[PDB]
Homo-oligomer: 234 residues x 4
């Protein structure tokens, strides 16, 4: 319905938000390719290709190899944990690489391609951590603030070329990566109890917003950072 | 099919964004009640009722008279024109009454009722003027900043009761009221030429986002202000 | 030394933050006039004039009657308390009148005057409530968000004239009116203990920032909102 | 009189905003040490030491070697130019190292020390580019947004220990680096609302407030001083 005739690439489509967005896009009629470290995770759900988003050459090769790209979703990311003194140089470099530099490359590859094919939509999954300080997320927040600034910079520069660039900034969403950090879904029951809404977000809730941004009806949004966080940053 | 179960009330559903939202809500399966000063405009389009949002008793009577209310959309508003010295006390009183005070009343009426029924979704149509300073919008900008603050306050307070409260913040959208502002359709191209995208927003672009926020998929968004402004605040 | 040869008007200079600003201004060499409902509180401290900031005519008459005005400080304000359903129309009208409309009037009177003399500085005392949602401040936060938007709108309009307009956004500051709504000392003390810094802000901490903004060294700040809130909005 | 008896370290104190801050601190009574790649620029005027802020070991050694430290200013930085496609990975690495990672290190060294010795004030010189998008500043904007996020994170974590952490976010300030980037200045001043560039002294006076006892209620703040350019 809403994405028929659109060609989409979703980076880190193997699980969680990335996967939910790939599945939602396909449901709305998009031709979707899910790039991920573990394409077997997508066996029989969405077309998939192996991609390590840390690999610049592979990111440029994949995007430049596509015939047409209408929507690019950057869902790749890692959540280092720790306050200022717990954080290490290795945390810093790993997180800035995957959370921000990877997206830099993907946009470098995709935006000219898109501009030269008329237009497009780029959707970066950031985090509410870009705006809201919480304990033990020193490195993570810095990477995500960088990502939002980059989203807006790209949006301004390519607006005259028909390419929209936006970020979605989720709060705490129940994902496989969250479960392994918090120890299963009843590990999650504790923190879900602390939320205002007494529950955690769903990947589907984030995917539906991405569908909007990818759609023809999302075409007047650019340079925006959409917070979906259950009121946690209030 | 995103709203098939839901009862929605749209205040100022007669034209522009409010009407686009009402029509879109209708298309997505919702039972819509359109309140407006001119109910004839919704004849054969959406069920309607006559309402002057400046009248506190009328606002409370309408909302408290409803059996069940799943979605409330506050699309009422006036756009006074002028810088600081051109602005009058009459502009101030009229704009704060309609743009802000009437929403205060609508929310006072609706949020307890929604709280009791287990949840719901309130959507305030604010403006990017709440965040982005532009010339000749002194009063308008103050009212819309007030409105976003109220949106967040209500969101925090009723999040435990499962009632979401969010704002959409449009940029320059082609509406009957903008056209009357611009002195006619002839005055629109000047506005469009100032836009990064070289075109004005479409009310449908705002409506699609309201559908997301009214839907079950929007249930993790609360206290957010969604900017859809064609990049103008970059 | 820092405000030598400056003429300053402080509205609501009779107590709290307003008084600290007037005293600090005078210490730094400015000629100061403290306008207040209660001029008796300033005798033998700063030159004083009776002024009810709710009275539009009186506000214009005082400001237009001054020979030269280099600095205007709007420190007037009231803090109603309550959530959405506790808040009243009385609260709304009173708070919007004093916190926002009176500043509208004062800037209408002052800014063209300052613009004609080639520069000046307007300092509005807003609140971190303009940005940060806290329980029980529904009306207050709305009025202060309005005030910050007005600050920026005026700043943009009069920047080419060399007149700066800025807001200081304090957190919880120890003032007679805070103690009037807390108790006097005992808690009061309870609230202080619970704060991040385990103390309330001092009026002098806001006043020193006001000195910067009023001074020639503050001439490159305009349209800014300076948060001084003991970290409470983090 | 605003900083009597305070001991301050200013990193990249050799020119521009860092230099103005070091001189202002001294006029306000502080004992100042200016650290810089070019201490010869400060000599006779401000006590100075050579420091390359890119060298992690050097940063920790200087800071942990100080007797006492009441105020730390991170004024180090670089402004790469270019849009998305112009920007290079080398631009990225060099700007994130100096603009952000070196501040990470300086705070890791200084904050625990301050916490154990009666608190203090850390002032990071960011940029209004952290908030306001302008053409040709893709990398720069990313680094300064990271820096503001870091400022707020550190401020929350160390508020309970008497340490304040704040950022000043300048607009376009007349500095030797700007002049080299750009007479030249004129064309860039014409397209400013105030029809002129910021002065380093205008930033420095705000740093004095933040460093002072009267600035102690500010923490986690990002103070914009940009001539209205982000309006
Ligand atoms: Cl008073």
């Amino acid at each position: 319905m809403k994405l028929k005739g659109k060609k989409a690439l979703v980076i880190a489509a193997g699980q969680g938000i990335g996967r939910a967005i790939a599945e939602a896009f396909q449901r709305e009629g998009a031709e979707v390719l899910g790039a991920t470290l573990h394409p077997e995770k997508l066996q029989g759900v969405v077309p998939a290709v192996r991609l390590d988003a840390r690999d610049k050459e592979a990111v440029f090769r994949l995007i430049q190899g596509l015939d047409r790209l209408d929507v690019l979703v950057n869902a790749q990311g890692v959540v280092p944990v720790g306050g200022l003194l717990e954080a290490t140089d290795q945390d810093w470099e790993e997180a800035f690489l995957l959370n921000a530099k990877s997206v830099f490359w993907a946009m470098q590859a995709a935006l000219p391609k898109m501009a030269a094919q008329g237009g497009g939509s780029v959707i970066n999954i950031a985090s509410v951590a870009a705006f809201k300080t919480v304990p033990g997320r020193f490195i993570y927040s810095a990477t995500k603030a960088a990502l939002v600034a980059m989203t807006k910079a790209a949006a301004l520069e390519f607006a005259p070329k028909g390419v929209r660039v936006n970020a979605i900034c989720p709060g705490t969403v129940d994902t496989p990566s969250l479960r392994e950090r918090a120890g299963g879904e009843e590990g999650l029951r504790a923190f879900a109890e602390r939320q205002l809404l007494k529950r955690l977000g769903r990947p589907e809730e984030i995917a539906a917003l991405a569908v909007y941004l990818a759609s023809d009806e999302g075409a007047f949004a650019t340079g925006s950072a959409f917070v979906v966080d259950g009121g946690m940053s209030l």
